[PDB]
Amino acid sequence: DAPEEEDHVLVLRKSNFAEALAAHKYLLVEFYAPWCGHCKALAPEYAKAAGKLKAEGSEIRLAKVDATEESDLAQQYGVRGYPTIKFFRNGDTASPKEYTAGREADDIVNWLKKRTGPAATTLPDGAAAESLVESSEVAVIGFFKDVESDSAKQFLQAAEAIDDIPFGITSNSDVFSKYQLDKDGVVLFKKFDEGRNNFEGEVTKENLLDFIKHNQLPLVIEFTEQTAPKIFTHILLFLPKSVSDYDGKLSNFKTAAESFKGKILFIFIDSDHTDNQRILEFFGLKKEECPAVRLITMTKYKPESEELTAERITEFCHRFLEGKIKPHLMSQELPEDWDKQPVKVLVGKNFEDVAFDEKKNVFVEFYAPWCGHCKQLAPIWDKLGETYKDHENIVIAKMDSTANEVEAVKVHSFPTLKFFPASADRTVIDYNGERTLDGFKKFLESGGQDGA
Numbered sequence: 001d002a003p004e005e006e007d008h009v010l011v012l013r014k015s016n017f018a019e020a021l022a023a024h025k026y027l028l029v030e031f032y033a034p035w036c037g038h039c040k041a042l043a044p045e046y047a048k049a050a051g052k053l054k055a056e057g058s059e060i061r062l063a064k065v066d067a068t069e070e071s072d073l074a075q076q077y078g079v080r081g082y083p084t085i086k087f088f089r090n091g092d093t094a095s096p097k098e099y100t101a102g103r104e105a106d107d108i109v110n111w112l113k114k115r116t117g118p119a120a121t122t123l124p125d126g127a128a129a130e131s132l133v134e135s136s137e138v139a140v141i142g143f144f145k146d147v148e149s150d151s152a153k154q155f156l157q158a159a160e161a162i163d164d165i166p167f168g169i170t171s172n173s174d175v176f177s178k179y180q181l182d183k184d185g186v187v188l189f190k191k192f193d194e195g196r197n198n199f200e201g202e203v204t205k206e207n208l209l210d211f212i213k214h215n216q217l218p219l220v221i222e223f224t225e226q227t228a229p230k231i232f233t234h235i236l237l238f239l240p241k242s243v244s245d246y247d248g249k250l251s252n253f254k255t256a257a258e259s260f261k262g263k264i265l266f267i268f269i270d271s272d273h274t275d276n277q278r279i280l281e282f283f284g285l286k287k288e289e290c291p292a293v294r295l296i297t298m299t300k301y302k303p304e305s306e307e308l309t310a311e312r313i314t315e316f317c318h319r320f321l322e323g324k325i326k327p328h329l330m331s332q333e334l335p336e337d338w339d340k341q342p343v344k345v346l347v348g349k350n351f352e353d354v355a356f357d358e359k360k361n362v363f364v365e366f367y368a369p370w371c372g373h374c375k376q377l378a379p380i381w382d383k384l385g386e387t388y389k390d391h392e393n394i395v396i397a398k399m400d401s402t403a404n405e406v407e408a409v410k411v412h413s414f415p416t417l418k419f420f421p422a423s424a425d426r427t428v429i430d431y432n433g434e435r436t437l438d439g440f441k442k443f444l445e446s447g448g449q450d451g452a
Contacts (some may be wrong), residue, residue, distance in 0.1 A: 007047030342385030
């Protein structure tokens with residue numbers, strides 16, 4: 001008990017950090033920089049909280065790290081500013097919970113108290129049992145008459161290894177009978193699908209974690225943009241609520257999900273809704289084009305037929321699982337005029353065979369319409385086309401890089417002028433020279449070796 005510390009707050013270097021991780025099962029670490037104004041204000045409140053845990057005889061220890069002094073210890077935790085407070089259970093560096101609440105001593109303390117102590121809540125009666133289940137979407141309850149058995153201990157070891165799910169443990173046999181159990185066992189409760197799964201086999205940590213990993217998550221899941229992080233190989237069903245046989249088609253989307261669990265994540269989204277737009281335009285779809293299906297992995301794919309049984313949606317997945325389905329690239333409809341004017345219009349389908357034509361010197365303007373800089377350049381580009389309208393090898397082109405995506409080259413800033421020489425090796429050269437007709441002409445005739 002003679003370790004470096006300030007006001008009951010452990011001073012952590014990179015030399016002792018993992019030593020305090022093991023010597024303290026509940027370690028709250030504040031990452032601060034001595035110049036940070038907000039780290040200054042938290043400092044006496046952070047220590048005030050450490051003294052109050054001390055007075056209660058709490059085992060929870062509060063520590064801090066001077067990011068200017070270690071620097072590599074802030075790098076090793078993806079720290080993105082100061083103060084940064086991370087909570088470590090069981091010295092596990094894999095799942096540190098970030099503290100994001102109030103920075104007064106009483107806030108910090110009440111936050112710790114609600115997530116310290118053993119990970120499995122002891123259940124004496126059916127009240128605490130069914131409360132634990134109702135308190136979360138997914139809950140796991142272990143049933144052990146002898147709580148000292150390895151099965152019980154391996155269960156508690158598995159409970160500590162998971163934080164996203166509440167764990168319960170009981171020895172009361174009124175509970176066993178209540179939940180239809182005559183012997184020891186583990187039951188996973190969920191508010192979806194079958195609603196309940198029972199564990200089978202040797203009750204070990206490894207087998208328990210695997211049992212939970214595969215039994216959480218619904219078969220098909222409702223898509224919300226707040227769930228997008230945790231959710232994201234996925235198959236996305238854009239299903240409107242207004243449609244007929246909604247339940248029937250949803251059923252077909254679930255039975256197909258039964259054959260790909262753990263490999264493909266089945267997600268259905270309500271297209272009729274107003275919050276599923278960022279994603280419905282991310283795939284370049286409209287409510288009218290739905291019901292629709294889009295599989296991804298960023299590689300995205302798209303089914304052949306447009307109908308939604310179980311067999312076709314399944315084989316579609318199988319077709320993707322072996323090539324047999326080409327990546328779907330976003331691309332406009334290639335207007336038949338596209339090449340009937342001095343400036344040839346490009347889209348996603350022709351691009352490669354146009355731009356990378358081995359007998360052509362293609363000059364493409366990647367653009368967008370609201371881009372004032374790409375409308376200040378529009379008259380100069382049409383003049384460049386008219387100048388080279390009857391040229392033999394030179395072709396002047398333009399593509400809307402919004403509604404089109406191409407694998408060959410990427411563009412996200414407009415306007416971007418790229419030149420594709422007439423060669424076999426698919427060479428590309430950027431034009432960063434004077435945006436003038438004189439500059440364009442000086443650059444083309446000179447092969448591209450002079451300019452930019």
